[PDB]
Amino acid sequence: NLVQFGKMIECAIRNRRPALDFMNYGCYCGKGGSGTPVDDLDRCCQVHDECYAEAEKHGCYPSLTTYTWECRQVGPYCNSKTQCEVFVCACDFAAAKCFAQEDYNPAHSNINTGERCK
Numbered sequence: 001n002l003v004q005f006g007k008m009i010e011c012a013i014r015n016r017r018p019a020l021d022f023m024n025y026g027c028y029c030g031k032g033g034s035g036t037p038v039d040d041l042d043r044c045c046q047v048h049d050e051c052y053a054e055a056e057k058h059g060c061y062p063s064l065t066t067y068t069w070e071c072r073q074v075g076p077y078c079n080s081k082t083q084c085e086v087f088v089c090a091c092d093f094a095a096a097k098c099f100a101q102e103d104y105n106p107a108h109s110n111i112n113t114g115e116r117c118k
Contacts (some may be wrong), residue, residue: 001066005092011071012096022099025109027117035117038108044098051091060084062091069093075100 006019026042027035028049037043052062060083067085069092070077076096078089111117 001063004067004069005096007071008069008076008092008096009099011076012100014100017104021104021109025104026111027113034113038111038116039103039105041099041102041104042108044095044102047098048091048095051094052088055084055087055091058087060087062088067092 009019009022022029022045024030026038026045028037028042028045030045033049037046055062055065065084065088067078067080067089069089070079076093078086078093080086080089
């Protein structure tokens with residue numbers, strides 16, 4: 001669920017920035033979901049959106065999913081059981097690792113998505 005994804009980001013990126021930074025960034029970081037991603041970080045978010053949308057297509061509801069995971073020395077680690085929770089944990093896991101790897105450009109935060117993401 002939302003809080004878990006937040007804690008998972010924090011874990012992956014070693015609390016280098018607030019998880020809240022990833023909620024208003026580029027064309028895809030935040031809720032939905034259009035145009036060309038402004039950079040590879042934003043593309044993390046696009047792939048994440050696609051992942052959730054696959055999950056929902058198959059009967060999961062990512063916003064209602066509370067999965068099982070742990071923050072380990074090596075990073076976030078999914079330890080879920082049911083199909084949906086395994087699927088949704090793995091969406092969040094790939095996005096969090098992606099965020100840890102990619103550059104965060106402050107000029108790409110809080111962009112006019114109305115105008116720049118069509």
